[PDB]
Amino acid sequence: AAMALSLITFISEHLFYWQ
Amino acid sequence: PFQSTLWLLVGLSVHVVAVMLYLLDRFSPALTLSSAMWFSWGVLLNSGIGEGAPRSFSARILGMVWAGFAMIIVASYTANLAA
């Protein structure tokens, strides 16, 4: 469960940092 | 206190979770692959080998609970011999 929620955090950080 | 099937399943867990670190170290928006193996191996064995402090939240957010995985598995061990 934690590693599944890990990927979302990285995507959210990457997407937010993009803009 | 353990069966034959237990070791070969927990043993393969460290490497399959170690590799997740490296993938999260080469897409950061400062850990090498070799050091990642040490950090994953060390925490379960409770030994101060090298330094494996990672960077970035996503790579670190796994490290939040990965150490805690050492707690439960080792904790149940002493529980058995008492039982």
B61, A9: Cβ pair inside 8 Å? yes
Return the residue of B nearest to A19 by Cα: B29
Note whether A17 contacts B29, CB cutoff 8 Å. yes
Please, which experimental method was used?
cryo-EM
Give the minimum alpha-carbon distance from A2 to chain B in angstroms, rounded to a whole number: 7
Residue B67 CA to residue B35 CA, distance in Å, equals: 16
Q: What resolution, expressed in A, was reported for this entry? A: 4.0
User: Which token pair is B50?
Assistant: 């090298």
DSSP-assigned letters across all residues of B6-75: HHHHHHHHHHHHHHHHHHTTSS-----HHHHHHHHHHHHHT---S-----SHHHHHHHHHHHHHHHHHHH
What is the rounded CA–CA span in Å between residue B83 and residue B81?
5
CB count in 10 Å sphere of residue B66: 20
Please name the residues in contact with A13: beta carbons below 8 A apart, sequence gap of 6 or more.
B29, B56, B57, B58
Note whether B71 contacts A: Cβ–Cβ < 8 A.
no
